[PDB]
């Protein structure tokens, strides 16, 4: 969705 994950408190690589 438009590329808003890395920014708005969302995705981030696990581990």
């Amino acid at each position: 969705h438009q590329l808003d994950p890395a920014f708005g408190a969302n995705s981030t690589n696990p581990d």
């Epitope: 969705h1 590329l3 808003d4 994950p5 890395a6 920014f7 995705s11 981030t12 696990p14």
Partner: antibody, heavy 116, light 107 residues
Framework: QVALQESGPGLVKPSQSLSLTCTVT?????????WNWIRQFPGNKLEWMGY???????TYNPSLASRISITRDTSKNQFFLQLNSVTTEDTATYYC?????????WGAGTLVTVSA | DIVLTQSPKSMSMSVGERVTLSCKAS??????VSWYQQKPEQSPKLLIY???NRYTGVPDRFTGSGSATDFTLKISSVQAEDLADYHC????????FGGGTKLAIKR
């Protein structure tokens, strides 16, 4: 339009701390959008160092996380990068950029050299 | 930490030819992959965001497809002006860029 422009030290000694300053024109850094610091090493390689969010939160790169600090000055409309313990591997050209739907508006990019 | 991989490190191409670069994610990034263009002594310029969406002022000759892992970029006709490095990056987890594909013109 959006016009980012970084400034700051050009050449700095090792073990010292670096400190750039990105100044933006034509959009408040407090109303929507991610405000990033990206660096480009000599040649081809890009590295996203981190960002200061609209609310003023911070998400650094899990590897430079112990050495960097991205703060802002909401009244001057500028956010700043701070790289501590600069090793000679850290020399590269630095950019500040707007982030929403990818990285859209990039700054001219100021080159920083870490040499004795 | 989501590794992305660009294929032709470099390419030589005539004019009017059909270029096609490729970018790959290590672990499903969805459709959050974007292409940038970097000319000599210039800052990158967004080309495609959302894996398939073209930006503004970006000429038709640039189109992108791809989803979760496999992404590509096309140029219907390479022009002299289309000389530069082409990067890609995922904006899913932590932003990580590809290795850049340097594209040169065959004269």
């Amino acid at each position: 339009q959006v016009a980012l422009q970084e400034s700051g030290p050009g050449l700095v000694k090792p073990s010292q701390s670096l400190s750039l300053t990105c100044t933006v024109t034509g959009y408040s850094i407090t109303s929507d959008y991610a405000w990033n610091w990206i660096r480009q090493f000599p040649g081809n390689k890009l590295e996203w160092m981190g960002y200061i969010r609209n609310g003023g939160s911070t998400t650094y790169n899990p590897s430079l996380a112990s050495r960097i600090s991205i703060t802002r000055d909401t009244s001057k409309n500028q956010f700043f990068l701070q790289l501590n313990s600069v090793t000679t591997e850290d020399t590269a050209t630095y950019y500040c950029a707007r982030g929403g739907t990818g990285f859209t508006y990039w700054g001219a990019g100021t080159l920083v050299t870490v040499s004795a | 930490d989501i590794v992305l991989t660009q294929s032709p490190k470099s390419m030589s191409m005539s004019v009017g030819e059909r270029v096609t670069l490729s970018c790959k994610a290590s672990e499903n990034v969805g459709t959050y992959v974007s292409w940038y263009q970097q000319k000599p002594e210039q800052s990158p310029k967004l080309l495609i965001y959302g894996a398939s969406n073209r930006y503004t002022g970006v000429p038709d000759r640039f189109t992108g497809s791809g989803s979760a892992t496999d992404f590509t970029l096309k140029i219907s006709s390479v022009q002299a002006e289309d000389l530069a490095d082409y990067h890609c990056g995922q904006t899913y987890s932590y932003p990580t860029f590809g290795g850049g594909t340097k594209l040169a013109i065959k004269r």
